[PDB]
Amino acid sequence: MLRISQEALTFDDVLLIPGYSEVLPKDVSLKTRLTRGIELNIPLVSAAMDTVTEARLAIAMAQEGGIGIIHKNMGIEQQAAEVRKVKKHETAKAKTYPLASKDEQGRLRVGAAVGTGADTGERVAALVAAGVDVVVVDTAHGHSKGVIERVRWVKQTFPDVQVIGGNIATAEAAKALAEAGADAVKVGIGPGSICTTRIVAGVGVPQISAIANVAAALEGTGVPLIADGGIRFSGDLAKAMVAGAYCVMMGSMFAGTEEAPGEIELFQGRSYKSYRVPYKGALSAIVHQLMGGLRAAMGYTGSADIQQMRTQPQFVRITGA
Amino acid sequence: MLRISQEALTFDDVLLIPGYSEVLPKDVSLKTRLTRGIELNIPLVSAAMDTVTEARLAIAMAQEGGIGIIHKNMGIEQQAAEVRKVKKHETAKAKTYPLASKDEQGRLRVGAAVGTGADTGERVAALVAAGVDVVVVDTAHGHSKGVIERVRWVKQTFPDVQVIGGNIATAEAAKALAEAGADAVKVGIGPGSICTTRIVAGVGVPQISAIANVAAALEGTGVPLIADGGIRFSGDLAKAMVAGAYCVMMGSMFAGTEEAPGEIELFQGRSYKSYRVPYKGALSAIVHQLMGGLRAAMGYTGSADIQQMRTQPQFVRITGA
Amino acid sequence: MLRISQEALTFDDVLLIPGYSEVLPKDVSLKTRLTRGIELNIPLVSAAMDTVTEARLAIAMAQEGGIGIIHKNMGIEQQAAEVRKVKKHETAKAKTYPLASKDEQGRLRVGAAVGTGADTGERVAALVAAGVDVVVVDTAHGHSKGVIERVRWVKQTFPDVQVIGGNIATAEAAKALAEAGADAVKVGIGPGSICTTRIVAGVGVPQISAIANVAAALEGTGVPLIADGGIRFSGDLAKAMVAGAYCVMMGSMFAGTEEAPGEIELFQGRSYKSYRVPYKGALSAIVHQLMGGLRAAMGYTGSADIQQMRTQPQFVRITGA
Amino acid sequence: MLRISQEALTFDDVLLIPGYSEVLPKDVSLKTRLTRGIELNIPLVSAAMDTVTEARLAIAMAQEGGIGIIHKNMGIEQQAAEVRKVKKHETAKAKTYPLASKDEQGRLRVGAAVGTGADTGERVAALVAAGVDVVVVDTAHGHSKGVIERVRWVKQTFPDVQVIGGNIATAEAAKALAEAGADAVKVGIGPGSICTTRIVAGVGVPQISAIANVAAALEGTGVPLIADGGIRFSGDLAKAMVAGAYCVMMGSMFAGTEEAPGEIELFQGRSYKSYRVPYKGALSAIVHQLMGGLRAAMGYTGSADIQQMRTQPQFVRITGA
Amino acid sequence: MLRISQEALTFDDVLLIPGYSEVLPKDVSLKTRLTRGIELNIPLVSAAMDTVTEARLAIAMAQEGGIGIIHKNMGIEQQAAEVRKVKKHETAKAKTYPLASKDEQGRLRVGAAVGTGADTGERVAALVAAGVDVVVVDTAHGHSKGVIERVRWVKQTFPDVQVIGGNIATAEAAKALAEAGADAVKVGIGPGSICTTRIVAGVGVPQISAIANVAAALEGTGVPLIADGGIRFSGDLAKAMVAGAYCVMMGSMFAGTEEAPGEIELFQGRSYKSYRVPYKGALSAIVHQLMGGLRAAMGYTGSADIQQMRTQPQFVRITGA
Amino acid sequence: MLRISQEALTFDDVLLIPGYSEVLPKDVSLKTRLTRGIELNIPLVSAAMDTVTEARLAIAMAQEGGIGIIHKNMGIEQQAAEVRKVKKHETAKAKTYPLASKDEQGRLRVGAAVGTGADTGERVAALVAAGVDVVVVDTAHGHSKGVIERVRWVKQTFPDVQVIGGNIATAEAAKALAEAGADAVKVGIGPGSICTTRIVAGVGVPQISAIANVAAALEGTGVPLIADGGIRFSGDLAKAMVAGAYCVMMGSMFAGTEEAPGEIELFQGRSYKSYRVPYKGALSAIVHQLMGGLRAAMGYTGSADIQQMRTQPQFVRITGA
Ligand code: NA
Ligand code: NA
Ligand code: NA
Ligand code: NA
Ligand code: NA
Ligand code: NA
């Protein structure tokens, strides 16, 4: 008698099935897209969190072949200044980053988040003027009048900038954002078992089904979808891609790295970052783990590139046992 | 080979799906009904428990826009006296409660519980004479000859008073109580995983399915249903409404508040209520949490009012994982 | 591709649904049958375990209106002597046991277990000569040539004695034992999640489905089935009856009672029985709990007697959550 | 919307159903095959792990009626020398091993593992020259060009030696290996809930379904399949056989035995093997437990031999509860 | 600079030193005195606690050769009635208690407690009229005007009854009570590490030193001292005697016995006494343990009787280690 | 060879010895002094902590008969304003506080803390002008040039105000502060086992010996000493007085009371104070516990008033055991 739409699956509900393979993990291609107009060499984005992405980590992310989204928990001038640092960054003498995400002028790519408040227009304008590549209209409920209208306003006001809208979790929301002119959508509403959205509001969609529903809705449109939340280890990342994601956004896993905000401190005979989270060392080692696991899964499933990984492998569904 | 009626779901089995929204949580309407004849400004009732509802908390509940049901674990004269205090309460000078549940004479509304024992008739008469708004025929098994007959006797003897019958958990029981003339039904038999009904008798219906089965049975009759049990946080409350409940009854969550029975004492360097349960401070802060979470869910699902919340949003079913 | 017969349910998978009731728990009838020819006033049997049933507990069990099965972990002469004590027991002056299970000569009823070894024939003969009411051919795998042949031999050699065969867990095994002439069957192979049969051999049938499959197979034959294992509290007992059991056998729950074998000793400032298990006091208090819970379930489901309890109420199936 | 092939079951999801039995556990036959051309008296193989199988344990395994696969984590000359020790081993005076796995010259049988690296050809040649009975092309992903080609190369280069290919987990992979000329396949990709393949790559197939899918694919071909992983106790072993396995490979359960590599040391007042794992005493006691449990399951299901055990008994599927 | 009287030792601070022995534990004498005028066959008293001593346990205590002190947490008439039951108790036919504590008329001996409130005089009179052997003026601080005056009043008003005063913990208090005419003193103020006297008031004397200080003060006076508190096992009891105690009072160790107040109930599958404490079975088994341990210590120290045990053996003092 | 001054004792090292008593706890006198010129009706001071003492709690403290010291973790104007609120507070109509600490104009007494920084002079002046009764020169190391000079400056600049200097822990420091003109001293350097002074600097004096050393040094001078730290329950408070303290300062035990700073919030279904610490309800209940325990100890030791409590009772020293 309940109005139940479907059973929805999370990462722990499924496993990838091995398939005939003739391309080794070291030889697969990880190239993909963030948005209609922005290509990435690896399917990885850093979250717009004040513990994760300011200019320093955004620069590292772009150097690795992904991209960072600078957070908005700061003044407009300050956020614009973080964007400028990335766009103006010049490669260290004696270092080479051949995977680096760059715009046509050869500058490192960067994103920045905005919300829907009364100073949003002013914030977007400052970010665009600072040379931002993509504006992320980033809210708790993207399938809403306010977000959809803000996405339209950005596309109308600044036609030359890429725009991401989110967060969403349904086919209908994906279509609405696409129609509003989003160049990509970000997927994740209550994706984790422990999130506050579930406990406070009783709301959420398990992330594997959320991703797959949004992927089917956007199939053949050219609009990428970004998976945002619920991913705990590299195995989950591979599952997200096979569910249909074009790339994955990481947050707290990147907090506490050298490039992330905060300062290293001694605590309990041990290094932490203080603003405390465990110090994690260089971002590059985490990226290596994540992308090594993805490469392994591509080898197991016989996927030679991301387009094959997203569309060809199958899951088995498993039990609690 | 087993006689299995259906699979029955509890709160943890389901999540609300986000929907297109254009009304913010702060702007939704929470108005609803307790019974055919009694409207509430918020969907919240306090339980007829001796740790929860006497006059002081009943007054606070009505001031918040809900209602309290005074417990029956006391003498008839005493319970009647608690009802009288509520009906005679005059608003503090310099305070305003614009949401307050009031009868046509402008007196705060109140309920009181009775059972089915030999002095029930006398107890009901005293409560009615004290000015009670609703009599709750409140038993462990409402789908029984004794309860159904008592509900009929109250409707026959005191036609001008509202009557709630319970507790029930099935479509057939809802219809039987409606036919007996109940102005609302209360839903919950073994709703919690930890309840004694399940352990001692092996009996129970998971509350999400119990609510939805009773809602379908009463659809189009004008008889409200009250959800009673199994609700641990605000997210569960929202799920109960979407399953079809008109309002929700809270018990132990309200015990230990300032307005609840008992006296504050120091225990282990910390405040408790003694008769011990943790002291919780003012009832209003709990109500704020519960209704804030409900408002959040209404925003997420795009429900502008309770009637939409009860009938329009969908669930996903999830796994243990 | 697996050869899966069915999904099988255990007690924790299901709950009883409340039904229209007009007979109170105190007023329901608990009368039932152990075998074609033996009626019990309560649906309770004590297990043939050396920690549970010798003459003293068998006498108490019969006085309560059930029956005990004397264990076979002793010499033939000794086991026969235990049977004789029960048959010769004379009611204490000034005590009355109006529910007592008695044969036509007015002697307390008793059972005794045998296996299939080389001295089984001699053991059966001694038990029968001692006046046993029912012989329980009691093995780990009753659906076997050895057990079926022993059941036939008992029916052929001693036509005037009742015979129970077990243990079984399938419809086919029930039919085979019935055909061999069993007056009842005992159900339970790997019924518990923790049993050695599951861990060592990978073998078992969850007890709710085992009971229901055996009940359907024996429907209309007049052959009772006894549920043996997996029952942890009174709620499980009620579920076993509704699944189709005629009565339930308890083992370790009865160990450590005053009437059970062993001697009380002080251990860790606390009473135990030593041969150690916690001392549990008088058997009657455990029986009261078990039968009180069954009565409660009968009231909830509106079952006026055991025949209605076995055939009329329904379950809901529930999730892990 | 997800590409889900099937629900896949693990050992804990299923139980064996008892069946009519007239052959006791002590009397069943355990004879089976490792490969097209190699018969075993018990369905047990030791893993090619450096903590498990060198010559000493391989000799014990063959004496018990199974076989060991010598690991490849050593130089080619060294691995060849381990094979030679087994082939040249002469039975101790005054000992008799009537179950022993022997070739036609009466020498104990032995296997050895190889991978796919650049010195594989040389390694295979040395093993064959040392008199190995079976070469195990043993990789993490057997359904790959490299493994399939290596299996073909072994069959072409050394037509008189048996070859096992693995590991696989699907019907398609089984067919590919059979076509490449494998004399058996080894089954197990991410079979355990805790394995690194699942966590790092998100890849795996629950072992009960993996076994059954491979069994169906190879039905009527004469190609055996070996179950490799996920088996924790003897009950799991029996389930693997009924799922379709011809024999089972054990690894870490055999580590720490007297015959396994490593040296006994005192640690925390207790014996360990150091290279540390608990000392387990003689291999024969573990084999006895495993085969005793299998015999018990064969008795319960009424399977007189392995061919009946693999093809006749049924499972029930059970819940988390 | 602190005013420290001495270091005070508790039971855990000391051990008894073995001495030359030629009398076995079974052959030592346990005879002693409760008061100037009352001899006991064992050095054991039951506490005046409402969970420990009413008539039933007092009778058992006297039968064992000790004595019970009936508690005062009841009406005066009720307490007098408990005393009367003991004095009027006639030995069961076919039982013999050759150690029994009896007065000159051959009636079982019994004590009863009083405090210092306004109805104390009336309470004492009722107890004496009921035939009590000893009145225990029993307070938290016996070295006080109120207690000393009450002890004098009892000795003056009822010269033929024995009187115990307590509780005390110093030489000065012992002398004051002796001077007031106490026939014995009871020792124990904050004796346990966990008592409320220490936590609330910061007051207490470790029991081994309290006993020894009181013993020295009363040496040569003929006034016994009773040790009351801090004794956890039989070893402590022996230490208390060697420290100078004439007998030992037990409280909570006796609660939960068959003879103690309360009724047996099933709780968590296990027997308790409810008023809950663990059921302990018959008092006699506890007494046997306590006196067996005392006998063992007497053997080890070569003490042939209580007078030697109290005056001859030595302790070693030990460290925390 | 170490330079060890003495063994130093903490509260857990000692217990109070009971003494002859003829004054009941309810009848003892708790009157004492804070400073040469300020008398208190109870020996209790609240700490100058920002979680403990602002005007609201200072007013409650003075009403109870003690005094509060307003903290200095705020601007000078703000701290002066808190002092003014206390001095200007007028007793609620219909309340009577007969124990209240008042100055000669009948205004509630209050203290305030200062340190030694560059704005200290200005801070002291503002406090004095606001009508403060006592200035507490409150530092981590009072036996220092800076503190001693500041104490002199306050006595010189404002001769009519009382001054407390601290913290100290030795006889020499007490004499130095007395000579500088302190009207009282505050005792406590590393008094707790868990304090940072001990862990970081290795510095501290166990509080019982610190108190007694300071008491002996100030004997006959008329200068009170205040015990500050290490006191966990009322029993410790009594021990501090007997060690020689005139009154005791409490900190964190008072944090979280209604009168203390912070605001009540719901957290984990339970009331806390947020700025989080457990909500403790009204200050008066804590004071009642502390002073009830002190009264109990005075009764036990036979101390009729504080002067007797400080000078007459004795301790026993106890072991870890
Ligand atoms: Na492919
Ligand atoms: Na809507
Ligand atoms: Na019925
Ligand atoms: Na068969
Ligand atoms: Na001696
Ligand atoms: Na005194």
PDB file of all heavy atoms in Angstrom, chain A residues 16 19 21 234-235 242 300 313 315 317 319, chain D residues 3 5-6 8 13 141 145 199-200 202 204:
ATOM      1  N   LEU A  16      31.373  -5.838  -9.136  1.00  0.00           N
ATOM      2  CA  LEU A  16      31.660  -5.932 -10.566  1.00  0.00           C
ATOM      3  C   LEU A  16      32.014  -7.358 -10.969  1.00  0.00           C
ATOM      4  O   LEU A  16      32.763  -8.030 -10.269  1.00  0.00           O
ATOM      5  CB  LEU A  16      32.810  -4.993 -10.954  1.00  0.00           C
ATOM      6  CG  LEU A  16      32.486  -3.507 -10.802  1.00  0.00           C
ATOM      7  CD1 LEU A  16      33.702  -2.672 -11.098  1.00  0.00           C
ATOM      8  CD2 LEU A  16      31.331  -3.141 -11.743  1.00  0.00           C
ATOM      9  N   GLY A  19      35.370  -9.722 -16.670  1.00  0.00           N
ATOM     10  CA  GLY A  19      35.027  -9.966 -18.065  1.00  0.00           C
ATOM     11  C   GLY A  19      36.284 -10.277 -18.861  1.00  0.00           C
ATOM     12  O   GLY A  19      37.386 -10.088 -18.363  1.00  0.00           O
ATOM     13  N   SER A  21      39.437  -9.883 -20.733  1.00  0.00           N
ATOM     14  CA  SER A  21      40.325  -8.738 -20.771  1.00  0.00           C
ATOM     15  C   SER A  21      41.572  -8.950 -21.636  1.00  0.00           C
ATOM     16  O   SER A  21      42.218  -9.994 -21.569  1.00  0.00           O
ATOM     17  CB  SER A  21      40.770  -8.388 -19.358  1.00  0.00           C
ATOM     18  OG  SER A  21      41.583  -7.229 -19.360  1.00  0.00           O
ATOM     19  N   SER A 234      38.606   2.849  -3.072  1.00  0.00           N
ATOM     20  CA  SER A 234      38.746   2.876  -4.517  1.00  0.00           C
ATOM     21  C   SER A 234      37.748   1.939  -5.190  1.00  0.00           C
ATOM     22  O   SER A 234      37.284   2.224  -6.283  1.00  0.00           O
ATOM     23  CB  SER A 234      40.182   2.518  -4.932  1.00  0.00           C
ATOM     24  OG  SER A 234      40.570   1.274  -4.375  1.00  0.00           O
ATOM     25  N   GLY A 235      37.403   0.834  -4.528  1.00  0.00           N
ATOM     26  CA  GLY A 235      36.433  -0.095  -5.091  1.00  0.00           C
ATOM     27  C   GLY A 235      35.078   0.552  -5.351  1.00  0.00           C
ATOM     28  O   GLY A 235      34.447   0.291  -6.366  1.00  0.00           O
ATOM     29  N   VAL A 242      30.917   2.468 -13.252  1.00  0.00           N
ATOM     30  CA  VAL A 242      30.167   1.459 -13.984  1.00  0.00           C
ATOM     31  C   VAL A 242      28.667   1.730 -13.870  1.00  0.00           C
ATOM     32  O   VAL A 242      27.908   1.436 -14.787  1.00  0.00           O
ATOM     33  CB  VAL A 242      30.528   0.045 -13.487  1.00  0.00           C
ATOM     34  CG1 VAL A 242      29.696  -1.022 -14.206  1.00  0.00           C
ATOM     35  CG2 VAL A 242      32.019  -0.211 -13.729  1.00  0.00           C
ATOM     36  N   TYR A 300      40.037  -5.921 -14.805  1.00  0.00           N
ATOM     37  CA  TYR A 300      39.183  -7.060 -14.462  1.00  0.00           C
ATOM     38  C   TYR A 300      37.953  -7.181 -15.340  1.00  0.00           C
ATOM     39  O   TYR A 300      37.493  -8.292 -15.648  1.00  0.00           O
ATOM     40  CB  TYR A 300      38.712  -6.958 -13.014  1.00  0.00           C
ATOM     41  CG  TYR A 300      39.553  -7.712 -12.030  1.00  0.00           C
ATOM     42  CD1 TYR A 300      40.099  -7.072 -10.928  1.00  0.00           C
ATOM     43  CD2 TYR A 300      39.756  -9.080 -12.168  1.00  0.00           C
ATOM     44  CE1 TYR A 300      40.854  -7.770 -10.007  1.00  0.00           C
ATOM     45  CE2 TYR A 300      40.502  -9.782 -11.252  1.00  0.00           C
ATOM     46  CZ  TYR A 300      41.047  -9.121 -10.171  1.00  0.00           C
ATOM     47  OH  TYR A 300      41.800  -9.814  -9.260  1.00  0.00           O
ATOM     48  N   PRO A 313      30.455  -3.101 -18.431  1.00  0.00           N
ATOM     49  CA  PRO A 313      30.481  -4.151 -17.395  1.00  0.00           C
ATOM     50  C   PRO A 313      29.150  -4.328 -16.670  1.00  0.00           C
ATOM     51  O   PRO A 313      28.297  -3.437 -16.696  1.00  0.00           O
ATOM     52  CB  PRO A 313      31.561  -3.659 -16.417  1.00  0.00           C
ATOM     53  CG  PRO A 313      32.410  -2.715 -17.234  1.00  0.00           C
ATOM     54  CD  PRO A 313      31.422  -2.029 -18.140  1.00  0.00           C
ATOM     55  N   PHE A 315      27.086  -5.804 -12.955  1.00  0.00           N
ATOM     56  CA  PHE A 315      27.173  -6.068 -11.521  1.00  0.00           C
ATOM     57  C   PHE A 315      26.539  -7.408 -11.186  1.00  0.00           C
ATOM     58  O   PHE A 315      25.653  -7.867 -11.906  1.00  0.00           O
ATOM     59  CB  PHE A 315      26.433  -4.997 -10.713  1.00  0.00           C
ATOM     60  CG  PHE A 315      27.042  -3.617 -10.768  1.00  0.00           C
ATOM     61  CD1 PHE A 315      26.507  -2.643 -11.595  1.00  0.00           C
ATOM     62  CD2 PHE A 315      28.108  -3.276  -9.945  1.00  0.00           C
ATOM     63  CE1 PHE A 315      27.048  -1.353 -11.626  1.00  0.00           C
ATOM     64  CE2 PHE A 315      28.642  -1.999  -9.965  1.00  0.00           C
ATOM     65  CZ  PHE A 315      28.112  -1.036 -10.808  1.00  0.00           C
ATOM     66  N   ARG A 317      24.340  -8.547  -7.808  1.00  0.00           N
ATOM     67  CA  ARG A 317      23.789  -8.082  -6.555  1.00  0.00           C
ATOM     68  C   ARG A 317      24.068  -9.114  -5.469  1.00  0.00           C
ATOM     69  O   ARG A 317      23.923 -10.319  -5.696  1.00  0.00           O
ATOM     70  CB  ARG A 317      22.294  -7.838  -6.699  1.00  0.00           C
ATOM     71  CG  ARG A 317      21.588  -7.822  -5.396  1.00  0.00           C
ATOM     72  CD  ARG A 317      20.576  -6.723  -5.364  1.00  0.00           C
ATOM     73  NE  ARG A 317      20.002  -6.601  -4.036  1.00  0.00           N
ATOM     74  CZ  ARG A 317      18.719  -6.362  -3.825  1.00  0.00           C
ATOM     75  NH1 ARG A 317      17.903  -6.232  -4.865  1.00  0.00           N
ATOM     76  NH2 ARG A 317      18.254  -6.264  -2.589  1.00  0.00           N
ATOM     77  N   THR A 319      24.001 -10.314  -1.055  1.00  0.00           N
ATOM     78  CA  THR A 319      23.221 -10.213   0.179  1.00  0.00           C
ATOM     79  C   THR A 319      24.048  -9.602   1.310  1.00  0.00           C
ATOM     80  O   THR A 319      25.266  -9.443   1.194  1.00  0.00           O
ATOM     81  CB  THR A 319      22.721 -11.598   0.671  1.00  0.00           C
ATOM     82  OG1 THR A 319      23.844 -12.379   1.097  1.00  0.00           O
ATOM     83  CG2 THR A 319      21.985 -12.347  -0.428  1.00  0.00           C
TER      84      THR A 319
ATOM     85  N   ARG D   3      23.059  -2.352 -14.688  1.00  0.00           N
ATOM     86  CA  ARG D   3      23.258  -3.592 -15.424  1.00  0.00           C
ATOM     87  C   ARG D   3      23.586  -4.725 -14.448  1.00  0.00           C
ATOM     88  O   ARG D   3      24.744  -5.049 -14.220  1.00  0.00           O
ATOM     89  CB  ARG D   3      24.356  -3.431 -16.474  1.00  0.00           C
ATOM     90  CG  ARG D   3      23.981  -2.470 -17.611  1.00  0.00           C
ATOM     91  CD  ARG D   3      25.100  -2.352 -18.642  1.00  0.00           C
ATOM     92  NE  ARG D   3      26.378  -1.968 -18.042  1.00  0.00           N
ATOM     93  CZ  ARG D   3      26.719  -0.719 -17.759  1.00  0.00           C
ATOM     94  NH1 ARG D   3      25.873   0.275 -18.016  1.00  0.00           N
ATOM     95  NH2 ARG D   3      27.898  -0.461 -17.207  1.00  0.00           N
ATOM     96  N   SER D   5      23.464  -8.587 -13.583  1.00  0.00           N
ATOM     97  CA  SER D   5      23.355  -9.902 -14.197  1.00  0.00           C
ATOM     98  C   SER D   5      22.450 -10.844 -13.412  1.00  0.00           C
ATOM     99  O   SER D   5      21.598 -11.513 -13.986  1.00  0.00           O
ATOM    100  CB  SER D   5      24.745 -10.521 -14.338  1.00  0.00           C
ATOM    101  OG  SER D   5      24.670 -11.784 -14.965  1.00  0.00           O
ATOM    102  N   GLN D   6      22.649 -10.897 -12.098  1.00  0.00           N
ATOM    103  CA  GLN D   6      21.915 -11.820 -11.235  1.00  0.00           C
ATOM    104  C   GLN D   6      22.188 -11.449  -9.788  1.00  0.00           C
ATOM    105  O   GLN D   6      23.101 -10.675  -9.512  1.00  0.00           O
ATOM    106  CB  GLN D   6      22.339 -13.276 -11.477  1.00  0.00           C
ATOM    107  CG  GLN D   6      23.807 -13.566 -11.089  1.00  0.00           C
ATOM    108  CD  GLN D   6      24.146 -15.062 -11.079  1.00  0.00           C
ATOM    109  OE1 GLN D   6      24.696 -15.584 -12.044  1.00  0.00           O
ATOM    110  NE2 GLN D   6      23.812 -15.749  -9.984  1.00  0.00           N
ATOM    111  N   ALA D   8      23.887 -12.981  -6.584  1.00  0.00           N
ATOM    112  CA  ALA D   8      24.875 -14.036  -6.374  1.00  0.00           C
ATOM    113  C   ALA D   8      24.969 -14.423  -4.893  1.00  0.00           C
ATOM    114  O   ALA D   8      25.002 -13.557  -4.020  1.00  0.00           O
ATOM    115  CB  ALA D   8      26.228 -13.603  -6.903  1.00  0.00           C
ATOM    116  N   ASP D  13      24.545 -17.843   2.662  1.00  0.00           N
ATOM    117  CA  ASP D  13      23.194 -17.656   2.127  1.00  0.00           C
ATOM    118  C   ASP D  13      22.379 -18.949   2.018  1.00  0.00           C
ATOM    119  O   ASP D  13      21.163 -18.896   1.827  1.00  0.00           O
ATOM    120  CB  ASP D  13      23.259 -17.003   0.735  1.00  0.00           C
ATOM    121  CG  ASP D  13      23.723 -15.558   0.785  1.00  0.00           C
ATOM    122  OD1 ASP D  13      23.242 -14.813   1.665  1.00  0.00           O
ATOM    123  OD2 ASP D  13      24.571 -15.158  -0.050  1.00  0.00           O
ATOM    124  N   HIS D 141      43.360 -13.023 -12.645  1.00  0.00           N
ATOM    125  CA  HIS D 141      42.317 -12.870 -13.655  1.00  0.00           C
ATOM    126  C   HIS D 141      42.600 -13.838 -14.808  1.00  0.00           C
ATOM    127  O   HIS D 141      43.282 -13.490 -15.761  1.00  0.00           O
ATOM    128  CB  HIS D 141      42.259 -11.409 -14.155  1.00  0.00           C
ATOM    129  CG  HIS D 141      41.092 -11.107 -15.054  1.00  0.00           C
ATOM    130  ND1 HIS D 141      39.913 -11.822 -15.020  1.00  0.00           N
ATOM    131  CD2 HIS D 141      40.921 -10.156 -16.008  1.00  0.00           C
ATOM    132  CE1 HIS D 141      39.070 -11.334 -15.914  1.00  0.00           C
ATOM    133  NE2 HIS D 141      39.659 -10.323 -16.530  1.00  0.00           N
ATOM    134  N   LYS D 145      43.716 -12.504 -22.057  1.00  0.00           N
ATOM    135  CA  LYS D 145      44.505 -12.957 -23.206  1.00  0.00           C
ATOM    136  C   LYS D 145      45.772 -13.663 -22.747  1.00  0.00           C
ATOM    137  O   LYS D 145      46.070 -14.763 -23.198  1.00  0.00           O
ATOM    138  CB  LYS D 145      44.861 -11.783 -24.122  1.00  0.00           C
ATOM    139  CG  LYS D 145      45.712 -12.190 -25.327  1.00  0.00           C
ATOM    140  CD  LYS D 145      46.324 -10.983 -26.015  1.00  0.00           C
ATOM    141  CE  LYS D 145      45.496 -10.556 -27.214  1.00  0.00           C
ATOM    142  NZ  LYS D 145      45.674 -11.482 -28.366  1.00  0.00           N
ATOM    143  N   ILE D 199      37.729  -4.654  -2.136  1.00  0.00           N
ATOM    144  CA  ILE D 199      37.946  -3.340  -1.543  1.00  0.00           C
ATOM    145  C   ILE D 199      38.676  -2.408  -2.501  1.00  0.00           C
ATOM    146  O   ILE D 199      38.349  -1.227  -2.599  1.00  0.00           O
ATOM    147  CB  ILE D 199      38.753  -3.428  -0.231  1.00  0.00           C
ATOM    148  CG1 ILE D 199      38.000  -4.266   0.805  1.00  0.00           C
ATOM    149  CG2 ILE D 199      39.039  -2.036   0.322  1.00  0.00           C
ATOM    150  CD1 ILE D 199      36.541  -3.863   0.982  1.00  0.00           C
ATOM    151  N   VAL D 200      39.678  -2.939  -3.193  1.00  0.00           N
ATOM    152  CA  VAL D 200      40.499  -2.127  -4.076  1.00  0.00           C
ATOM    153  C   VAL D 200      39.831  -1.904  -5.429  1.00  0.00           C
ATOM    154  O   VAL D 200      39.857  -0.794  -5.966  1.00  0.00           O
ATOM    155  CB  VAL D 200      41.884  -2.779  -4.301  1.00  0.00           C
ATOM    156  CG1 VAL D 200      42.637  -2.089  -5.427  1.00  0.00           C
ATOM    157  CG2 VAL D 200      42.698  -2.742  -3.008  1.00  0.00           C
ATOM    158  N   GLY D 202      36.545  -3.312  -6.365  1.00  0.00           N
ATOM    159  CA  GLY D 202      35.090  -3.418  -6.378  1.00  0.00           C
ATOM    160  C   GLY D 202      34.603  -4.648  -7.132  1.00  0.00           C
ATOM    161  O   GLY D 202      33.443  -4.730  -7.548  1.00  0.00           O
ATOM    162  N   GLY D 204      34.161  -8.903  -7.720  1.00  0.00           N
ATOM    163  CA  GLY D 204      34.071 -10.219  -7.118  1.00  0.00           C
ATOM    164  C   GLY D 204      32.774 -10.929  -7.427  1.00  0.00           C
ATOM    165  O   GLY D 204      31.793 -10.304  -7.828  1.00  0.00           O
TER     166      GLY D 204
END
